[PDB]
Design a protein around this nucleic acid. Structure first.
Ligand SMILES: CN[C@@H]1[C@H](O)[C@H](NC)[C@H]2O[C@@]3(O)C(=O)C[C@@H](C)O[C@H]3O[C@@H]2[C@H]1O
Ligand SMILES: [K+]
Ligand SMILES: [K+]
Ligand SMILES: [K+]
Ligand SMILES: [K+]
Ligand SMILES: [K+]
Ligand SMILES: [Mg+2]
Ligand SMILES: [Mg+2]
Ligand SMILES: [Mg+2]
Ligand SMILES: [Mg+2]
Lengths: 63, 85, 131, 163, 96
RNA sequence: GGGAGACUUGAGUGCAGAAGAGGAGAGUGGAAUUCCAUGUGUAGCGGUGAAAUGCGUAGAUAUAUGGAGGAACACCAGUGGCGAAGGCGGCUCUCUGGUCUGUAACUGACGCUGAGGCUCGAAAGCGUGGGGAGCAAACAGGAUUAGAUACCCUGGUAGUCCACGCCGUAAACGAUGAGUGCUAAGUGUUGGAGGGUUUCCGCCCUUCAGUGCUGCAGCAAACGCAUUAAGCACUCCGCCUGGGGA
């Protein structure tokens, strides 16, 4: 199930740590879009947001 | 800039609302060519953007050749206005 | 970019004939209509109808198949091409399959078959062979 | 399909090829024979037979050729019209010839045409000379041949109007 | 014009007066160099996912600004933010 | 073919949208290796098919905490995307190219190809000046072997990195020039568009452009290709004519 489409949000702020945490596995590794059921476009946007969040410290790089 | 493009189109339009025509396209192409020449002189190594510039130059030359073939007087007038050779 | 619409027309007929398609459509022209009517009155096609549009008109051809769905048109070939134009004098007019086929020829009297051309004793441009 | 029975068929051995299969001990020699069986009246066919012995291979080929008989249109002493037949590398061109010109062909094509009954024709093999492929190419051209009556009936015109 | 969003982290230790001085100083920088700060705010105070400059805590402050793309306000802000010690880390992103 | 007109479908402009490791410039982030400093700590560590060289009582390896510096960017990541090709994968910003889908306001054939020319062009290499962690031609040592100018092991310079300028070659490959049209289907996937549902999500249908797989007709020496042709056709260019010599 594409969570992004279900929630019906078109913009992915890199500040919504609550939103991002459901797309990263334990240890902080990003999840495959096949695993998460999300689409390709949303996956790219999530990737950018998660990377930016990691840089700004909202999310951990490892562990 | 689309506003710059629109004002150029209005200036060189053969008549009202003539978006596409040899003169309009050539004028717009020339302004883009000049701006992109500045960009290349700034970034000598932007070879891909330079290829786009060369495509624009070739297209502009083809339009000029067609205009010269069709109406030489308009060709002379346009080169005078745009300062071309 | 298309460079020989007549050759493209012949190719469309050949491909549709190969797959035994019932009909085919082509952009229309005076030469194409001449060729189509020659085939019509020679019996190589079932019928020809013309559709009027805003661009250039459209010509529709109904392929003719005999009993057992046999193809009447064996094949078509473009003889005179933009790369190499072909012209034949009166005594040079060809016979396709010893007359079983036809050769569409354009002359001062218009687009006519080889039989008519050599009956009139005139040459021209050998547009195509059909058989 | 053509029924071999009721037809006075005669055969000619186009070629006998000594073919080998390599086996653990050594060679295993066999004979592959290509045969053309015809009626001298417009019916002809070709067959292939493999056997340890030449006579058996020829017999198998003749039986196969009878099963594969085909009929060829013929106008007078020659074929109706020019035709080029291709099978694999084989490529044969055949054109009608005037009366008395003979069968100007080579090897396998001579057998096919003579057996089919054609007497005056010109031919040229523009492809490979492999006997099996040239024979196959020849029959492809002969099948391509067409009859004036059938063509006229198909086109919906009289034979005179066609010609 | 092009919309920018600027989120920067002020160190946890700073006094409120010093933080206000820092925020006002950088607002002046943006305005003078040509950017129009449509809004500025202290977004939150959060523990960092990892230690940054020897701190496990920070004060995330957001600044939504608008400026022409050619204007160098963003560039000057970035230079000065790097120079300053009070700010730990800053991110500037174009926002649609 | 020439000349004089007309036309809008090709071509391009406008208008409205879409995605992208496209390119160039300047910054910046964490992981990890090596080195450096200082703790704890004692005899090995490292390596091989097996060993040895090597490092270690001048306290190594390991371990904790810092600091330095260079290079590449795990997860996402996917016959996924972009690019003419080479190629492009952290993130941020500036400049900039192209492509695709809508509409049909605009010009009215303005197009395709393109010898000679010009530009780009992996890696290696060359010049000048820096940078240099890791890796590593050459080279040193230890092994292996009949020999071992190798494969294996321990080190290791150029180089790999950056800036400018040369070099212009690759199995630079889809070993398949470019443009255009036509010729069964089935099924994934990328970016759009429209509609019928659907509360939305979504589902279904239609369609445009990419990308894959299977597979008709047709083609093929066969292997196989098959709307992303190696099928049916036309235009232009490049190239081939037994092997070696070369
Ligand atoms: C081990 N026995 C072998 C074995 O059976 C071989 N078949 C696989 C067999 O084969 C043969 O029969 C053959 O046909 C070949 C020949 C060289 O030896 C023959 O004897 C062969 C026998 O000697
Ligand atoms: K800073
Ligand atoms: K862009
Ligand atoms: K160098
Ligand atoms: K390559
Ligand atoms: K020679
Ligand atoms: Mg290099
Ligand atoms: Mg080594
Ligand atoms: Mg070469
Ligand atoms: Mg497709």
């Amino acid at each position: 199930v594409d969570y992004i489409a279900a929630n019906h949000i078109e913009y992915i702020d890199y500040k919504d740590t609550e939103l991002l945490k459901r797309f990263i596995s334990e240890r902080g590794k990003i999840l495959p879009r096949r695993v998460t059921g999300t689409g390709a476009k949303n996956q790219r946007k999530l990737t950018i947001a998660i990377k930016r969040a990691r840089i700004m410290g909202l999310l951990p790089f490892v562990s | 800039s689309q506003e710059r493009k629109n004002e150029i189109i209005k200036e060189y339009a053969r008549h009202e609302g003539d978006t596409g025509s040899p003169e309009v396209q050539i004028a717009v192409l020339t302004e883009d060519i000049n701006q992109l020449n500045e960009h290349a002189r700034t970034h000598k190594k932007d070879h891909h953007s330079y290829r786009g510039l060369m495509k624009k130059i070739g297209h502009r030359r083809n339009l000029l050749a067609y205009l010269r073939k069709t109406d030489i007087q308009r060709y002379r007038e346009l080169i005078q206005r745009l300062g071309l050779r | 970019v298309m460079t020989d619409p007549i050759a493209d027309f012949l190719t469309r007929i050949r491909n549709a004939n190969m797959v035994k398609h019932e009909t085919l459509e082509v952009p229309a022209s005076k030469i194409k209509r001449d060729i189509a009517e020659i085939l019509k009155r020679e019996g190589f096609i079932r019928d020809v109808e013309y559709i009027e549009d805003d661009k250039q008109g459209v010509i529709r051809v109904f392929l003719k198949y005999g009993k057992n769905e046999e193809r009447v048109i064996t094949n078509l070939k473009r003889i005179s091409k933009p790369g190499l134009r072909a012209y034949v004098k009166a005594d040079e007019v060809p016979k396709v399959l010893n007359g079983l086929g036809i050769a569409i020829i354009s002359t001062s009297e218009g687009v006519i078959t080889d039989k008519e051309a050599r009956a009139k004793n005139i040459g021209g441009e050998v547009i195509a062979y059909v058989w | 399909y053509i029924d071999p029975k009721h037809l006075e068929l005669e055969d000619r051995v186009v070629a006998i090829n000594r073919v080998t299969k390599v086996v653990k001990g050594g060679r295993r020699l066999r004979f592959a024979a290509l045969v053309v069986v015809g009626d001298k009246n417009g019916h002809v066919g070709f067959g292939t037979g493999k056997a340890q012995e030449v006579p058996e291979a020829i017999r198998k080929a003749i039986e196969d050729a009878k099963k594969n008989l085909v009929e060829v249109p013929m106008v007078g002493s020659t074929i109706p019209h020019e035709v080029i037949g291709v099978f694999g590398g084989g490529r044969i061109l055949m054109k009608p010839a005037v009366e008395g010109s003979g069968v100007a062909a080579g090897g396998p094509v001579r057998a096919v045409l003579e057996l089919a009954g054609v007497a005056d024709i010109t031919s040229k093999s523009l492809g490979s000379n492999t006997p099996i492929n040239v024979v196959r190419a020849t029959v492809e051209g002969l099948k391509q041949l067409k009859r004036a009556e059938e063509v006229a009936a198909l086109r919906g015109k009289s034979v005179e109007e066609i010609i | 014009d092009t919309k920018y969003e600027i989120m920067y982290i002020i160190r946890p230790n700073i006094d409120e007066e010093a933080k206000t001085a820092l925020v006002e100083r950088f607002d002046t920088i943006l305005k003078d160099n040509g950017a129009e700060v449509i809004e500025s705010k202290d977004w939150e105070k959060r523990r960092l996912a990892y230690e940054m400059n020897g701190f496990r805590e920070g004060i995330y402050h957001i600044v939504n600004v608008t400026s022409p793309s050619t204007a160098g306000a963003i560039n000057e802000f970035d230079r000065l933010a790097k120079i300053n010690d009070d700010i730990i880390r800053h991110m500037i992103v174009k926002v649609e």
